[PDB]
Design a protein around this ligand. Structure first.
Ligand SMILES: CC(=O)N[C@H]1[C@@H](O[C@H]2[C@@H](O)[C@@H](CO)O[C@@H](O[C@H]3[C@@H](O)[C@@H](CO)O[C@H](O[C@@H]4[C@H](O)[C@@H](O)[C@H](O)O[C@@H]4CO)[C@@H]3O)[C@@H]2NC(C)=O)O[C@H](CO)[C@H](O)[C@@H]1O
Ligand SMILES: CC(=O)N[C@H]1[C@@H](O[C@H]2[C@@H](O)[C@@H](CO)O[C@@H](O[C@H]3[C@@H](O)[C@@H](CO)O[C@H](O[C@@H]4[C@H](O)[C@@H](O)[C@H](O)O[C@@H]4CO)[C@@H]3O)[C@@H]2NC(C)=O)O[C@H](CO)[C@H](O)[C@@H]1O
Ligand SMILES: CC(=O)N[C@H]1[C@@H](O[C@H]2[C@@H](O)[C@@H](CO)O[C@@H](O[C@H]3[C@@H](O)[C@@H](CO)O[C@H](O[C@@H]4[C@H](O)[C@@H](O)[C@H](O)O[C@@H]4CO)[C@@H]3O)[C@@H]2NC(C)=O)O[C@H](CO)[C@H](O)[C@@H]1O
Ligand SMILES: CC(=O)N[C@H]1[C@@H](O[C@H]2[C@@H](O)[C@@H](CO)O[C@@H](O[C@H]3[C@@H](O)[C@@H](CO)O[C@H](O[C@@H]4[C@H](O)[C@@H](O)[C@H](O)O[C@@H]4CO)[C@@H]3O)[C@@H]2NC(C)=O)O[C@H](CO)[C@H](O)[C@@H]1O
Ligand SMILES: CC(=O)N[C@H]1[C@@H](O[C@H]2[C@@H](O)[C@@H](CO)O[C@@H](O[C@H]3[C@@H](O)[C@@H](CO)O[C@H](O[C@@H]4[C@H](O)[C@@H](O)[C@H](O)O[C@@H]4CO)[C@@H]3O)[C@@H]2NC(C)=O)O[C@H](CO)[C@H](O)[C@@H]1O
Ligand SMILES: CC(=O)N[C@@H]1[C@@H](O)[C@H](O[C@@H]2O[C@H](CO[C@]3(C(=O)O)C[C@H](O)[C@@H](NC(C)=O)[C@H]([C@H](O)[C@H](O)CO)O3)[C@H](O)[C@H](O)[C@H]2O)[C@@H](CO)O[C@H]1O
Ligand SMILES: CC(=O)N[C@@H]1[C@@H](O)[C@H](O[C@@H]2O[C@H](CO[C@]3(C(=O)O)C[C@H](O)[C@@H](NC(C)=O)[C@H]([C@H](O)[C@H](O)CO)O3)[C@H](O)[C@H](O)[C@H]2O)[C@@H](CO)O[C@H]1O
Ligand SMILES: CC(=O)N[C@H]1[C@H]([C@H](O)[C@H](O)CO)O[C@@](O)(C(=O)O)C[C@@H]1O
Lengths: 269, 263, 264, 263, 269
């Protein structure tokens, strides 16, 4: 796309608000919505098969944007340009719950609070004018992913590091395993992505929330994501950490993410 | 509201100071004020019923500003906020499980574990999203919750809304600020989890937060009311017998307001 | 004070330096100076009497400034440098410390660990205090300055429970903190890091300046030509071989720059 | 080089992207690619021989830039660099020691312990200082080291120099960037130690590092070659039987260069 | 010193590079160079004698500076003024070693990596125009330091906090105990010092290195350290943590520090 002037005038700025609910593995609108199922662990890389529901997948949506009021006789067209966003992890408040079927601090004395949600935090969101471009990369290439999940079958040993042949695009919600796909830095010219990972299984989650924080989406040339087909593409994963039962079974807990995106009209050839 | 120019003049600027005491669960002005009761844990999400006093609720107050009456409204432009009583956490003598419990020796372990620190300043009640760890939790009569909220309440459900209209009855673990509303409120929150996490608190009288949005407009005080909200969970208090309670701290608010003309 | 203009001139700016030694509980010029005594723990809030020497108290000093005079002159504190001193001593892991591998009588001492409480205040009058305690039923010793029978509301904010920091080494840290409702003529700064096995984190440099001017460009104004310095610097806990634990504190350095201010 | 004006014109600016795969010890395109072999520990410094495959080495590449030829040289002005595959660390199912290994229950403990993250961009190979924890370590024949380095190699010895001239054979534990040289390279590194430390990793396509020195001169690419180097140790992978291995991640580089006139 | 104008001109700016090796206690150019000897612990403050080699001392050097080419007939004097520095802890790379004679993560199973270096980090450097001025302060005043060490003997109970009588100057390398001396904030008008302490015995060391970071040494008056007798005084201590043997004996491990200092000519009266 050849990028020209910002289009100013009334109705040249618009704002969308959207949510993505987490896809930690357990089915929608059933009792464990927001959790994975209890995590089983293989004995060997050669006999490793994570059952469906026991691992998180990326959340993704395309938002239909307002009509642009195109200049019919112009050589150029208008595109919605994402210039900034606010994003918040919602429901951070629920993590003050230390009474709901949790392994207790002093379990052998049957006493104390629940241990609450602890362990790894993976927080990533992406905002783009097209689907997020992905690099396939896995901890163990011999893992057999279930048929429900979108992966590269038989990826080979090279997939445990960078292999330029192992590409994909985030085209579906709740099926691309977080542990098998990451943003592709060789692409995503038309998307901004941000991730943080904090590991461990006893690590305290650290989360902030405010309605006062803006992130600029303009690149070094002052150009934000340009919305192809008048679609805004939102992607995230928000693993907060693990829920531990009394019997020590552990499951991923996730939280939904809020997006507010400010878009302006851009002239393109 | 269509917002016009800041109305300058004598007594155009005012300033309020307020405190909000914590609502950690134990009754006001009795021996465990500032604490929850000892936390009990359910064996299943199906049979989860947190008794009244065992969980914290949000604090809220409405501050009467000077009557004013295009109309004039009070606009919140800046604020200072402090957690008060951080000094008390230097107490490691008061009935605390000891570092070397089996040698009956050492200091108390003091207050540790999760920190949840949030405040809000607005010209109307804080707009809330209902969201729970376990939708099947049965909250007590004293608590304001959405009864039988359903499985979608464990993540974001756009039907599950409320507003912070009463002090010390909205469970922290059941309500958070709604980012889809609150256009006339600024809110700020941090959570640090765990049960043995070291608390970290700063205090100074030197730090100001600006409450103006991108357009230079602060919260506009509907009915000449300034709405203040917070929760300040510092961590857990552990008894010798390993019973654990929430401990909270009061919050100081200084808010500077100016006269603003609105349509 | 109605504050008028900065009085500029040859003798218009002065600098003071002072130290406050910590008040962790053990008596001055004796073998445990800088420490508390070994901490004892009550069984319940109803029978809770922290003995003298077993808890730290605030340090405070009034520095006499050069005597100055419709209007009068007052020293205005415009900036300060403050440092925790003797951070170097915490590299000591040989001095009668519980060992890392106590069961094997092997490894270093565990050193100082646990809670950090670092606070200082610079003002033109005594620091204004809010009384607030973990447990209102605690019986404080005769040596300590507290509000006796403070009531259940002293566990949170009670607007009646006020004091001013008017004596060194007797206001328990665990019973008093800065009053944000007052202190218009004082600047205070504090950080608490809790826990009993937390690593202490301390920095020191001679290159950091804190500006003491308020939003209106006025610093603390020294009433009666007095500059009021306050701090508490709890570094953490010293653990003996027999698992007895004491507070360890460090002294704090102040450099304060003051200018002459005309007031009505 | 004496440095003169920046050359300007249609093709005065070029951008390269490159990846360096990690060199953690296990052979490429085999089943443990990205890991070290299981780490064995010596009994004393005098009998200390870390087997090949059990320790990480530095990754390195020379990128061929467009040929140019007062001479013209490519000047590296800025870069973006990202650790790739951070996503893979959400795997807590693959042959890992479990959180409650005695109960055969809970997630894997995942990757934890030491982080070593460093990268360098230069117009010649990275200049290295040899420095080892134990000078008596006997490195294997596959490794490039200073043999019999002396007790002084446990600290700084100005005799113990090298250059990173080969990928996957300079051990991280024996070579670091030489601050007495690398006038024509920019390096950056972070070490977080321990064996149960939680890894902390961030990734974004939005961060630029400026490579210009105080004089406004970037790395000047000798022989029209751009030299990339890194090491990205994320932590340790722990088996059920408690055998531990280094896990590494590949690094992405984007470097912007401009034509620069020199003597 | 009456400080006057900066002297500009062709040779008015110079850069020096230097290293200070650590003085952790074990002898130079022997097998444990860079370590302390294994730390013994007293039972009581009254019977406390840290043996020579079991505790780190401060590193210090006077760097001889290039000739100034003085104005022979001028009433004024040129002095080198230290305006900025880069400083780097070197050898951070070596701490990736978890194989050399280290207590293992799973010592009972004789399995896992070494625990590596962990515990306290003490990192201070000072750049001055004269020797660093010290304040004597000890954890325990009744400690008897070895004859090899420079201390104030029988310093009294006041030496456990601030005593204005208990001063010294860092006049020798490898003999001033870190645990007995720190920078005197009441002096050092002609030196800049910087210190960080992170305590504990199992704390993870955190160290960064770059050739891109510069520290300005100018005071509030735009004046850097002025190098008296044309000497630049460099000091540091860089305790990284402890090394733990299989038999649980523990030693300090230190690292060398790199200094690059930029100096300009300053006219003084
Ligand atoms: C992640 C995974 O699937 N692991 C399962 C695997 O473990 C083996 C692997 O981690 C390989 C990777 O190289 O290492 C094996 O351990 C061996 C090697 O490190 C070896 C040196 O290369 O050293 C030890 O073996 C020596 C000797 O060298 C061998 O030739 C000999 O057969 O055995 C010797 C034993 O002292 C070391 O043990 C891993 N093996 C074990 C055991 O951990 O497969 C095992 C089943 O064997 C488990 O299923 C793991 O989950
Ligand atoms: C949070 C809560 O209230 N938990 C209580 C509940 O625990 C069960 C839930 O955590 C569900 C969530 O899906 O999982 C149960 O564990 C099961 C499942 O993960 C299952 C796969 O979906 O895999 C295991 O069960 C298999 C098999 O599928 C079962 O049909 C069979 O009966 O047992 C197999 C065991 O190998 C896994 O156990 C949780 N159940 C238990 C048990 O943890 O219910 C229990 C009592 O049942 C407790 O009250 C929990 O607190
Ligand atoms: C800080 C302090 O001084 N603690 C001492 C105190 O502990 C008691 C207090 O913490 C109060 C605060 O509300 O709670 C008591 O625990 C009770 C309550 O939480 C109660 C619900 O309010 O639930 C339990 O008690 C029930 C029942 O109500 C009792 O009547 C019955 O005898 O026990 C039931 C057990 O299921 C809960 O235990 C604290 N009590 C104990 C015990 O910890 O007083 C105790 C001695 O009683 C110690 O001196 C503490 O140090
Ligand atoms: C890193 C390594 O290779 N360690 C192996 C080595 O450990 C010895 C080294 O750590 C040296 C370093 O100085 O110290 C030995 O421990 C000694 C010394 O600290 C010594 C004072 O210099 O004090 C103790 O020894 C005294 C006495 O001096 C000895 O002559 C007498 O035999 O023992 C006395 C008992 O207190 C102290 O133990 C380290 N020795 C031991 C043992 O840990 O050598 C050992 C086996 O000898 C292992 O191979 C280590 O891995
Ligand atoms: C750092 C050091 O050298 N410690 C060694 C020392 O420990 C003693 C000191 O820590 C002093 C400091 O004031 O306290 C002793 O513990 C006592 C005191 O805290 C006392 C109140 O002041 O309370 C306890 O003692 C009570 C009673 O008050 C005493 O009068 C009576 O003799 O003992 C009572 C026992 O309950 C508390 O124990 C420290 N003593 C001990 C023991 O820790 O000396 C000891 C040997 O005495 C060791 O050498 C320490 O390393
Ligand atoms: C991947 C595979 O084929 N593994 C084989 C084992 O399944 C098998 O042992 C049987 O395991 C049964 C339970 O199987 C799963 C499960 O659903 O729990 C299958 C999952 O794929 C597996 N998880 C992963 C991440 O690979 C999971 C896990 O290994 C364990 O639950 C431990 O947490 O096992 C059932 O319990 C049978 O009783 C048991 O025989 C063995 C048979 O030798 O072969 C394995 O290769
Ligand atoms: C300082 C003093 O006077 N200590 C006396 C002890 O030395 C003495 O017990 C004897 O100790 C012998 C070993 O002495 C050292 C050592 O290991 O070299 C001497 C060190 O000065 C001391 N360290 C410190 C920091 O004070 C060190 C330490 O206490 C222990 O090693 C434990 O780590 O001891 C040897 O073991 C003899 O067998 C032993 O008798 C006792 C005698 O009762 O009095 C102490 O006052
Ligand atoms: C969250 C929850 O469901 N708590 C319930 C507890 C716990 O199940 C157990 O005490 C475990 O501590 O049991 C009660 O009898 C009680 O203590 O009075 C009723 C309470 O409703």
């Amino acid at each position: 796309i050849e990028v020209l002037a910002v289009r100013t005038g009334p109705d040249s700025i618009t704002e969308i608000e959207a949510y993505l609910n987490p896809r930690m593995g357990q089915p929608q609108n059933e009792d464990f919505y927001g959790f994975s199922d209890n995590v089983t662990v293989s004995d060997d890389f050669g006999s490793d098969a994570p059952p469906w529901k026991q691992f998180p997948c990326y959340s993704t949506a395309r938002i239909s944007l307002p009509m642009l009021n195109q200049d019919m006789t112009s050589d150029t067209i208008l595109m919605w340009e994402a210039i900034s966003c606010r994003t918040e992890v919602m429901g951070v408040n629920m993590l003050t719950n230390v009474h709901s079927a949790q392994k207790r601090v002093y379990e052998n004395d049957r006493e104390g609070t629940g241990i609450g949600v602890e362990g790894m935090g993976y927080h990533m969101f992406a905002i783009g004018g097209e689907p997020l471009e992905l690099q396939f990369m896995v901890f163990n290439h011999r893992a057999t992913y279930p048929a429900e999940a979108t992966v590269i079958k038989n990826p080979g040993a090279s997939s445990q590091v960078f292999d330029p042949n192992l590409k994909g695009t985030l085209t579906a919600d709740g099926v691309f395993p977080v542990e098998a796909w990451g943003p592709d830095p060789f692409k995503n010219e038309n998307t901004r992505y941000f991730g943080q990972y904090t590991g461990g299984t006893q690590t305290p989650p650290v989360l902030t929330f405010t309605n006062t924080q803006t992130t600029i989406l303009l690149d070094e040339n002052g150009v934000g994501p340009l919305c192809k087909g008048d679609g805004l593409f939102l992607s995230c994963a928000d693993i907060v950490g693990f829920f531990t039962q009394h019997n020590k079974k552990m499951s991923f807990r996730g939280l939904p993410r809020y997006f507010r995106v400010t878009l302006r009209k851009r002239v393109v050839k």
